[model samples]
Target: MDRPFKQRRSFADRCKEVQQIRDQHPSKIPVIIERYKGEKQLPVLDKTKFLVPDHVNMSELVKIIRRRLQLNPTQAFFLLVNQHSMVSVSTPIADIYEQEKDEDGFLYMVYASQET
Candidate 1:
């Protein structure tokens, strides 16, 4: 891969070669789920729930929500726990998705079924 510029292939060709190599590689990618310890036991409140909304006076509760929803942290962090790995915290979803797809000429949204 560290050959002269004259011997280098196009980006597409190189990508195909890399994809072929990866297809042959003996590695497995596993699905991971992130868990929040504090919120794990919180009761689920839907539209029909009869619980009254209490005013949050504690700063710790705000910090917990911010961390859980990734309000304060502006970077994504991959963490592993008990043989499971998951993406925790960080930036806005659209920003992250755009960054990852920066190289591509198109943007895709599965929910909207739209490409731009």
Candidate 2:
């Protein structure tokens, strides 16, 4: 079977999916987190969509991403929004979502370093 990438369904379907979650989970943020396109060394998630608490900051989310990824400290990980630009780890995920969640109403993150 081919993994065609995340949320590749009809745009309206994607928005509708989030719409139902919003109606049902007023306190959660729907995230479609993905492994960076450049990430060959890392494991791909069986599923990457997440329903996260609205109040948690990216700093908090960052740590959890590591745990879910089964990440090892030796390998290192960097979480990014806009695919690879850095984010203020302390900023609220809700607010960040407001500024630049995908146009389809999902927030996206990519794993792997920004690469200095």
Candidate 3:
């Protein structure tokens, strides 16, 4: 038995398909931060697992790291993806995870102190 082929889809139908795909996936991505140099001393973040929503920007992630490190506003830190590409704070977690995540499904990053 052969069914009739529908070649065209409405714009609303396309949007609904996208929404369905989004709904089926997890809303939060698991993240692991690996510290380097002066940033390594903090026991609170070492190999600790953290969950971040897909929508939050990298700046908020920085703030979270800083808060965990107990760094003041004047201190400087660098967050790098896989010890190579340096992503801006404006970058989204979902975007980073989409591009740089390993097979383990964790978005790996190294945060280090910027020497004064």
Candidate 4:
């Protein structure tokens, strides 16, 4: 037996629907960075507060933190989410934030240094 035909939506209509859904959500999320095991205390007193886009990559996120910390190019940095293993550079920040964020909607990032 044949079922009833489904209605096909236009591409523009789909795009608009997606945009509307996105507009209803917060574009930027707050990420908390803490120094779990590092040489010095974070340079910024309020380094815990970081606003990042949902689509940012972990590698880019690391670079952003490094820049804020004025890290030397020769120095190596490591980032960890959920206080677990090192996060993959290619992973989207949104995925980690959603899965492992704290009660205050903060994604905790542990900053560390590696000996080259």
Q: Report the number of the highest-TM-score candidate.
A: 2
Q: Give the top-scoring candidate (lDDT).
A: 2
lDDT value for candidate 4? 0.60
Off by over 4 Å in 2: 1-7, 84-88, 113-116
At residue 47, what lDDT does model 2 achieve?
77
Clashing pairs in 4: none
Candidate 2 lDDT tens digits, 5-104: 3436778888898899999998899997777777767777667778989888898887877787786787767788875444346877887889978887
Query: Tens-digit lDDT track for model 4 on 1-116?
Result: 12111124444654454455456657865665666544463443244546677898887777777787786677766677764544456777777776886554456677776422
- In candidate 3, position 56 carries an lDDT of 87
lDDT of 4 at 88: 52
Q: Estimate each model's TM-score.
A: 0.20, 0.85, 0.61, 0.61
**CA error at residue 66 for candidate 3, angstroms:** 0.9
**Better candidate number, 2 or 4, judged by lDDT:** 2
**Mind giving the per-residue lDDT tens digits that candidate 1 earns over 1-116?**
33321135465754554355346642321111222323332322211101112232223222433354443254333232232221342333233333432132111111001111
TM-score, ranked from best to worst: 2, 4, 3, 1
